[PDB]
Amino acid sequence: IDLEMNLFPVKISNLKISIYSWLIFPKIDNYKVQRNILEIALSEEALYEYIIQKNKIYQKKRHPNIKRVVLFQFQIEINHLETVYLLDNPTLQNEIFGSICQTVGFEQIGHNYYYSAERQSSQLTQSTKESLKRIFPAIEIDGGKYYLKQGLTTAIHSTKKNFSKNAISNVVELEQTSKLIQKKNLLEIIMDLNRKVKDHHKIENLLIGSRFITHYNNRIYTIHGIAWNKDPTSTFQITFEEYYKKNYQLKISDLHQPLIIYYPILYFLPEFCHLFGLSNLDADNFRIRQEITRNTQMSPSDRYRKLKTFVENQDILEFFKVWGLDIDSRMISMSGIKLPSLEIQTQTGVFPINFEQSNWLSLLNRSQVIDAPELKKWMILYPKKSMSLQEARKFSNDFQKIAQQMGMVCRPPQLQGVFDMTKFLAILKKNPSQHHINSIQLILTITPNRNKTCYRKIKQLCYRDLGIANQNVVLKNLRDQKRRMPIIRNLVRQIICKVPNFNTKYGGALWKIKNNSIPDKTLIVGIDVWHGKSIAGIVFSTDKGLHYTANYTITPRKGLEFIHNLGKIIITQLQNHYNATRQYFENILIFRDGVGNTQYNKILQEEFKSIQQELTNSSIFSEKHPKIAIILVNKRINRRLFHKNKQGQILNPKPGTFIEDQYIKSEFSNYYLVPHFSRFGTTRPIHISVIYNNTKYVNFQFVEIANILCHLNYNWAGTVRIPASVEYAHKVADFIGSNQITSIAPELLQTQFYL
RNA sequence: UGAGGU
Ligand SMILES: [Mg+2]
């Protein structure tokens, strides 16, 4: 099965690069006049071949330092600083690549590059310019409100003894990425909110956590606060108005505007910012989401053609070859391996997946469930202001009949309406005896407001004070009839997994696998971190990826990603399993989440040493050490795989296909897995990094296991991208962090409360 | 917050 790999083999010439430093006698840092005067000076000296990267200049040939006064509108310095070969340092190679991509027309936003119209270089011909405009058009969203800039994310990587026919020195990764910006500035948004909200604190709540790009400097930041008592007229030590006039030459319109705060404390003027991504007021708009998804999702044929016509452009290739990087227009020839077909089973029948058919909602709608606890004393909460009595009764009735159809035996609930929708549960917690808090197994909730404060309040209060699981639906999302029945069926699906069982205190199980490649006597561990007070979530599964007994901890330092006491909470669960079953786990697979960018490897080794110390210290488990496997799986990658049929047509790789990365120079064995299926567009794979292994089975079985976990995600009826043990950990972390839980009641920890 | 891929 032939495949193509979006890494172009780049032949890099050992060009001698000279680094020059420039200074300007006047105290001007306008980011545009400095470049202009530098260009004037370079033209005066007549060095056409040059590269400008902020404070340094790249040249192919070393020439002496020239300083001269430029008569404009004034001493321009040149200082030789560095000269090493290009081949040795990938950092340089990336810098020249980025500067060239900036020259050809792209703008460096964050770490990516995005096309534009004004910041362009004239040496490009009109045909090439039109082709680039077509390939990377600035799409308009919402009829003049949102820009959708389409550009490339790039990286230069060294090869690891590549077979081809000669070994290539380096490869280049190219990914087409679309980024959304909003036309309106921050000041307009805050004024609009103040018009209707009329509450500064509520405005801070709505605006906090959002990302914004400043255009005068074009850098991205996160909203950490807003000072309303602070005005541009006030002074700060190096007034903000004078600071912008001198440093950036931008006229200020609002002298009484508040200033947004982004501490490492820096203050930014909202009139010169723009929100990042979809607006919160339109976050879940169906038509808006459909339009953006249509405009950013490229069919595999479309994406492949776009990439091929971009790379095959002889003019851009000449531009890059000038600076020693000869990109090969062809693509890496490659042969992949398809994992064995997987068969899903339930309590009713056995139905293999075979080719495609990677969604099985029909199976769950026409069959029963595996594990489901009887619902006896469950509560139903509906708003009494938006009172629909007979509608509430019929909702209870159809919920009951669907639960009966799903194999989950259910009892009539206690339909109760509240004005407050929050204080009823407070009264419930105040009186255990009257309300029988321990008797309630589940409290279904209906809130019509969708506000993120009430929802967080109910999910935190039901889990920190009572320990009764709840399920939330927005009343508007329920009133319509087109997707009401699917929504209620998915409600049954989530409730099955979200209510504790009486026997083993476990959640429900929806499907299993007929033949799991997961070896017997194995504890699958999935760990993720949500960084905000940052929380690390962990999930252990003694069975072959069926039930997860989650746990959480506070990462010692905010922003840091390293668990201090991983070994303690792992040996605790091993001891619990030994006490329960008098059995010792033969294998322990750790599917930790992260990016192995030379820091996560050290962190993972530190965690491994910590767990080794704890487990050797453990008297019970010292003499028999369970085998350990530390495997990194990654979500945010810019890699893709393209598939070729006999007729030479682009197609998504068949789901479950995988490959071993023999090109990137990494110390550990990497694999690329496409687990899922998407109807439209190329599907982004996942990066299985096998950092540490002691277990007998080869890494191929590990990739197969990860694919199995992918084909076991209970939240989505069909296959998913990230293996369930990792997404579950991420969901644990997101739930604990977002809802500010002080401590989850231990009884619910074994339940799948994160779904 | 019906939910995953985008
Ligand atoms: Mg949910």
Numbering used by the authors: 27 to 99, 103 to 193, 198 to 271, 282 to 307, 322 to 589, 595 to 817
Paper text:
Argonaute proteins are the central effectors of RNA-guided RNA silencing pathways in eukaryotes, playing crucial roles in gene repression and defense against viruses and transposons. In particular, a deep-branching PIWI protein (HrAgo1) encoded by the genome of the Lokiarchaeon ‘Candidatus Harpocratesius repetitus’ shares a common origin with eukaryotic PIWI proteins. Contrasting known prokaryotic Argonautes that use single-stranded DNA as guides and/or targets, HrAgo1 mediates RNA-guided RNA cleavage, and facilitates gene silencing when expressed in human cells and supplied with miRNA precursors. Thus, this deep-branching archaeal PIWI may have retained an ancestral molecular architecture that preceded the functional and mechanistic divergence of eukaryotic AGOs and PIWIs.
To illuminate the structural basis for RNA-guided RNA cleavage by HrAgo1, we examined HrAgo1 in complex with a 21-nucleotide guide RNA by cryogenic electron microscopy (cryo-EM) and single particle analysis. The resulting reconstruction, determined at a resolution of 3.4 Å, reveals a binary HrAgo1-guide RNA complex. Resembling eAgos and long pAgos, HrAgo1 adopts a bilobed conformation in which one lobe comprises the N-terminal, linker L1, PAZ, and linker L2 domains, connected to the second lobe comprised of the MID and PIWI domains. The first six nucleotides of the guide RNA 5’ end (g1–g6) are ordered in the cryo-EM map. Low-resolution density for four nucleotides at the 3’ end of the guide RNA (g18–g21) is also apparent but uninterpretable, while the remainder of the guide RNA is unstructured. The catalytic tetrad of HrAgo1 comprises residues Asp585, Glu623, Asp655, and His792. In the structure, all four catalytic residues are ordered and in position to mediate divalent cation binding and catalysis, akin to the catalytic site of AGO structures. This implies that HrAgo1 adopts a catalytically active conformation. The negative charge of two phosphates of guide RNA nucleotides 1 and 3, as well as that of the C-terminal carboxyl group of HrAgo1, are neutralized by a Mg2+ ion as is observed in pAgos and PIWIs. In HrAgo1, guide RNA nucleotides g2–g6 are pre-ordered in an A-form-like helical conformation.
